[PDB]
Amino acid sequence: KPEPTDEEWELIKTVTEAHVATNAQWKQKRKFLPEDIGQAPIVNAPEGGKVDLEAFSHFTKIITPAITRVVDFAKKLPMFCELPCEDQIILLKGCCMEIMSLRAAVRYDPESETLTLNGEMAVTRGQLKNGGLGVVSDAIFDLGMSLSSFNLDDTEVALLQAVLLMSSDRPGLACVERIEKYQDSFLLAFEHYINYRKHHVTHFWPKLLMKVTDLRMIGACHASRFLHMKVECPTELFPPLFLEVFED
Amino acid sequence: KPEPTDEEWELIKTVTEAHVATNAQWKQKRKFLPEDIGQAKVDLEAFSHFTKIITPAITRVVDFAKKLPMFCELPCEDQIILLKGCCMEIMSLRAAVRYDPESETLTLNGEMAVTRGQLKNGGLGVVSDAIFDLGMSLSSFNLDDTEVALLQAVLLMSSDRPGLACVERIEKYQDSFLLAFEHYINYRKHHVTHFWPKLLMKVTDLRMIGACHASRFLHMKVECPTELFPPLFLEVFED
Numbered sequence: 192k193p194e195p196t197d198e199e200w201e202l203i204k205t206v207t208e209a210h211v212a213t214n215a216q217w218k219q220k221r222k223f224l225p226e227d228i229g230q231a232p233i234v235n236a237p238e239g240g241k242v243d244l245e246a247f248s249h250f251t252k253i254i255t256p257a258i259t260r261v262v263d264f265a266k267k268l269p270m271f272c273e274l275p276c277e278d279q280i281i282l283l284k285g286c287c288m289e290i291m292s293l294r295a296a297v298r299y300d301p302e303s304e305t306l307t308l309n310g311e312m313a314v315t316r317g318q319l320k321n322g323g324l325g326v327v328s329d330a331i332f333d334l335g336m337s338l339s340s341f342n343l344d345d346t347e348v349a350l351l352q353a354v355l356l357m358s359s360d361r362p363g364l365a366c367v368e369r370i371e372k373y374q375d376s377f378l379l380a381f382e383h384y385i386n387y388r389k390h391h392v393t394h395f396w397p398k399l400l401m402k403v404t405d406l407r408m409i410g411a412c413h414a415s416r417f418l419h420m421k422v423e424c425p426t427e428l429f430p431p432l433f434l435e436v437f438e439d
Numbered sequence: 440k441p442e443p444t445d446e447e448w449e450l451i452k453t454v455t456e457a458h459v460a461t462n463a464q465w466k467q468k469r470k471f472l473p474e475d476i477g478q479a480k481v482d483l484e485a486f487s488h489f490t491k492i493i494t495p496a497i498t499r500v501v502d503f504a505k506k507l508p509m510f511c512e513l514p515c516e517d518q519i520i521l522l523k524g525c526c527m528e529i530m531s532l533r534a535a536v537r538y539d540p541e542s543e544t545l546t547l548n549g550e551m552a553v554t555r556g557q558l559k560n561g562g563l564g565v566v567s568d569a570i571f572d573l574g575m576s577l578s579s580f581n582l583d584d585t586e587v588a589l590l591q592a593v594l595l596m597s598s599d600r601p602g603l604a605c606v607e608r609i610e611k612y613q614d615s616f617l618l619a620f621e622h623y624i625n626y627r628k629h630h631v632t633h634f635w636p637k638l639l640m641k642v643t644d645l646r647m648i649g650a651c652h653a654s655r656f657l658h659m660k661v662e663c664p665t666e667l668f669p670p671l672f673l674e675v676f677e678d
């Protein structure tokens with residue numbers, strides 16, 4: 192089962208660096224969002240039905256740095272830098288929430304039941320759900336839980352992000368064929384890396400590939416949450432980079 | 440326009456996984472079947488090459504249906520009727536969505552690119568034309584995996600197959616799938632006019648392919664040795 196060629200190892204170092212350079216620290220230094228913030232001590236109705244404005248405002252406080260790390264990750268890929276600006280824009284819009292969600296999910300902590308967003312803010316499922324994500328909180332927690340057994344490393348996470356980045360079916364793309372070829376290149380190196388890694392579970396490759404489909408739906412589902420957030424939250428709490436990536 | 444409920448997201452995830460897990464990888468992994476195999480009834484050489492891949496083609500549809508808990512809760516008997524009813528419908532949608540306008544080939548199973556003439560002469564007759572033309576229509580629909588998945592679930596849960604024991608429970612599932620599909624499409628905003636009417640009509644085109652195919656199959660049985668017919672092909676298509 193082939194292992195990475197030399198050129199593939201080089202692509203691997205490029206993507207791995209791009210990712211670790213934009214993925215600050217994570218255990219220790221992590222502060223918990225105060226337990227009062229977006230959680231009733233005793234839950235009496237299904238959660239996530241209206242946006243808790245206080246929780247929401249704490250999340251939007253760290254969302255600018257969060258989005259910029261995704262943007263800096265992409266800009267360190269020599270393949271992304273060959274695309275024209277309009278395709279760059281559309282691909283960042285398409286994959287932003289998919290990569291953010293992946294990252295948060297790999298920071299799942301089984302003992303506290305928390306995700307640590309940005310490597311700095313630990314949140315529970317209720318707090319993330321109530322502060323705007325609704326059911327997307329479940330999808331990210333659940334994905335986080337199911338990913339522990341995959342034992343992902345930096346390279347594997349980086350590679351998934353580049354697969355997600357290079358999706359040629361975002362609406363509006365001009366360089367559809369070039370983007371798919373880059374995706375295929377990333378995917379071929381990825382599979383070869385997985386062949387080298389030898390995780391001890393059957394059909395690991397297709398099992399891991401499936402997570403790309405899940406992260407796609409999470410992104411689609413969040414696009415609906417953004418709309419509900421737009422109607423329920425006052426405008427002043429939406430940072431301009433938040434609006435720029437998730438609008439339109 | 441309403442968007443998916445939380446419960447509709449959960450079905451969407453279920454059906455979409457079902458489909459992507461059983462739809463193997465394709466821009467390139469594909470191998471053009473040599474242009475001398477079905478040049479221009481029933482070319483025994485071309486046909487032989489299609490039945491070689493038909494067994495994997497059907498167990499894919501089978502596995503797709505078996506990853507839907509709604510399907511696995513119905514009685515065995517109904518499952519068998521649903522799957523025979525829809526097999527060729529779904530196979531033809533998958534082939535059609537892999538239509539390549541540059542080569543004017545469909546890619547079967549994501550592995551065997553063929554032209555209109557090969558699939559035609561290899562046994563499908565005019566059904567090849569109908570898959571190809573559906574392949575041309577769908578181009579500008581840009582269905583994603585969820586949309587194809589949902590379509591496939593609509594074809595599956597067709598409550599009018601003859602002999603079905605649980606008519607109303609299959610209709611009710613088909614309505615769950617139809618409501619999630621519309622809601623999903625409402626938020627996807629494709630740039631064709633009357634997108635939803637036009638997509639639903641694709642279902643009626645597909646149901647006809649399957650009907651037409653059931654009749655092509657009897658011609659195939661007349662004209663090709665029974666030995667070339669893999670036992671799963673026979674099991675899904677034969678009375």
Ligand SMILES: Cc1cc(-n2ncc(=O)[nH]c2=O)cc(C)c1Oc1ccc(O)c(C(C)C)c1
Pocket residue numbers: 213214247250251253254256257258260261288290291292294295307308309310319322323324331413
């Ligand atoms: C703010 C935030 C950041 C990440 N994230 N993003 C980049 C990164 O490098 N690491 C990380 O955890 C992950 C998630 C799930 C995240 O939560 C949200 C994502 C999207 C979103 O709209 C909201 C509103 C509730 C503000 C929160």
Ligand SMILES: Cc1cc(-n2ncc(=O)[nH]c2=O)cc(C)c1Oc1ccc(O)c(C(C)C)c1
Pocket residue numbers: 461462486489490492493495496497499500527529530531533534546547548549561562563570
């Ligand atoms: C072999 C074949 C497979 C599919 N198909 N089935 C499942 C799938 O996942 N993808 C796919 O293309 C679709 C078509 C249209 C197809 O061609 C045939 C369908 C039916 C049929 O009877 C024949 C005979 C000529 C052998 C060929």
